[PDB]
């Protein structure tokens, strides 16, 4: 009832880290564990983003068509 957004590319790399840095650095918040790894992501190689990225893309793409359809006549009161 409204296709929302999926991953970013970072999103995958991020999930994978969330615990790992939050445990190693238990002095961060969800905005620090995210800020730190966010930077990492930016400088994770790029060739190390691609693997994750491809997923984020595939899903955002799906969404965009599922919403395009949602509105097309997908909705609870559309069918």
Curated annotation (Swiss-Prot):
Q: Write out the ranges of the annotated region (Binding to AGER/RAGE).
A: 58-79
Functional description taken from the UniProt entry: Multifunctional redox sensitive protein with various roles in different cellular compartments. In the nucleus is one of the major chromatin-associated non-histone proteins and acts as a DNA chaperone involved in replication, transcription, chromatin remodeling, V(D)J recombination, DNA repair and genome stability. Proposed to be an universal biosensor for nucleic acids. Promotes host inflammatory response to sterile and infectious signals and is involved in the coordination and integration of innate and adaptive immune responses.
Location of N6-acetyllysine modifications: 35-36, 49
Q: What is this protein called?
A: High mobility group protein B1
- Protein family (similarity comment): Belongs to the HMGB family.
The text the record gives for the protein's domains is: HMG box 2 mediates pro-inflammatory cytokine-stimulating activity and binding to TLR4. However, not involved in mediating immunogenic activity in the context of apoptosis-induced immune tolerance. The acidic C-terminal domain forms a flexible structure which can reversibly interact intramolecularily with the HMG boxes and modulate binding to DNA and other proteins.
Provide the protein's localization: Nucleus; Chromosome; Cytoplasm; Secreted
Taxon lineage: Eukaryota, Metazoa, Chordata, Craniata, Vertebrata
Q: Which residues bind DNA?
A: 3-71
Where Phosphoserine occurs along the chain?
Answer: 8
Processing after translation: Phosphorylated at serine residues. Phosphorylation in both NLS regions is required for cytoplasmic translocation followed by secretion.
Assembly: Interacts (fully reduced HMGB1) with CXCL12; probably in a 1:2 ratio involving two molecules of CXCL12, each interacting with one HMG box of HMGB1; inhibited by glycyrrhizin. Associates with the TLR4:LY96 receptor complex. Component of the RAG complex composed of core components RAG1 and RAG2, and associated component HMGB1 or HMGB2. Interacts (in cytoplasm upon starvation) with BECN1; inhibits the interaction of BECN1 and BCL2 leading to promotion of autophagy. Interacts with KPNA1; involved in nuclear import. Interacts with SREBF1, TLR2, TLR4, TLR9, PTPRZ1, APEX1, FEN1, POLB, TERT.
